[PDB]
Amino acid sequence: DLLENLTAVIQDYPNPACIRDETGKFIFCNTLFHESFLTQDQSAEKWLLSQRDFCELISVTEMEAYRNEHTHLNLVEDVFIQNRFWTISVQSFLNGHRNIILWQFYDAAHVRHKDS
Amino acid sequence: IDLLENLTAVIQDYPNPACIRDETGKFIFCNTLFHESFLTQDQSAEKWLLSQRDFCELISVTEMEAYRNEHTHLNLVEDVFIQNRFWTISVQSFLNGHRNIILWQFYDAAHVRH
């Protein structure tokens, strides 16, 4: 199914990434997500809740991404986490009516905007 | 078990046009919405690309990404006019074995929060 395929992509993905469901559960976090963020033997949820400003930002972005903006690119830009600035894309995928939400973390300097 | 196969499955019925190109510039897969939005006459994606007059930046960015040895960049090519409307196109490279594949995803716009 979609979840298995997305997991396979993300686990071969060379930056931190994770998959969530509509309930806030972290379904899967890739190796680099663990190595970047989960270095206190802590759960992804505990990590998230410890990052006040980021949690507040990504919570709203994630709701916008999966409820409204399936055809818009949803980014949280230039957020400081774990001694670096990140930019995070948030995208939802449907399996039937089940939303599967992807967070992909990029170095903020590795995301470039440019007109046509 | 291919990265390419898994990625194809993810984007197949995803509600944005999206396509995958190989490192040489061949279209290797276009999703359903890509066909519906862009290939309405069953023309090749290759001919559709050649017809575009607003693709200078997209093409330049894609060439650079096609040869990258690291796969962590996201390039957003904003306000590309195709036919009669604007798209924002993201460009990402993925490792498939030892070669690169390039994913284009087509959005109505990018929404940035700080």
**CATH code for the domain of A9:** 3.30.450.20
Contact A13, A34 (CB under 8 A): no
Q: Which of B10, B33, B64, B73 to mutate to test the interface with A (most CBs of A within 10 A)?
A: B10
Residues 16 through 45 of chain A touching chain B, CB cutoff 8 Å = none
Q: Which residues contact B5 (CB under 8 A, 6 or more apart)?
A: none
Contact B94, B100 (CB under 8 A): yes
| Interface contact flag, A75 B110, Cβ < 8 Å | yes
Number of domains making up chain A = 1
A40, with CB counted inside 10 A (0-12, 13-18, 19+), is exposed
Give bridge partners of residue A75 from the DSSP assignment. A89, B112
Q: Which domain holds residue B96?
A: 1-114
Which candidate from A5, A64, A112 shows the least CB-CB separation from B10?
A5
Query: Entry resolution in angstroms?
Result: 1.5
Angle between helices A2-11 and B3-11 in degrees, nearest 10: 130
Identity of the amino acid at B88: T
Q: 3-state class of B103 per DSSP?
A: strand
Q: Is A114 on the interface with B (CB under 8 A)?
A: yes
A7 — alpha (psi -120 to 50), left (phi > 0) or beta?
Answer: alpha
| Interface contact flag, A77 B114, Cβ < 8 Å | yes
Chains A, B: CB contacts within 8 A come to 105
Query: Solved how?
Result: X-ray
- Nearest chain A Cα to B5, which residue? A5
For every residue of chain A, DSSP letters joined together read -HHHHHHHHHHT-SS-EEEEETTS-EEEE-HHHHHHH-TTS--HHHHHHH-HHHHHHHHHHHHHHHHT-TTEEEEEEEEEETTEEEEEEEEEEEETTEEEEEEEEEEGGGEEEEE-
- What is the Cα–Cα distance from B65 to A11, expressed in whole angstroms? 21
Cα distances (angstroms) measured from residue B108 to each of A69, B54, B88, B89: 9, 16, 6, 9
Q: At A56, phi and psi to the nearest 5?
A: -60, -45
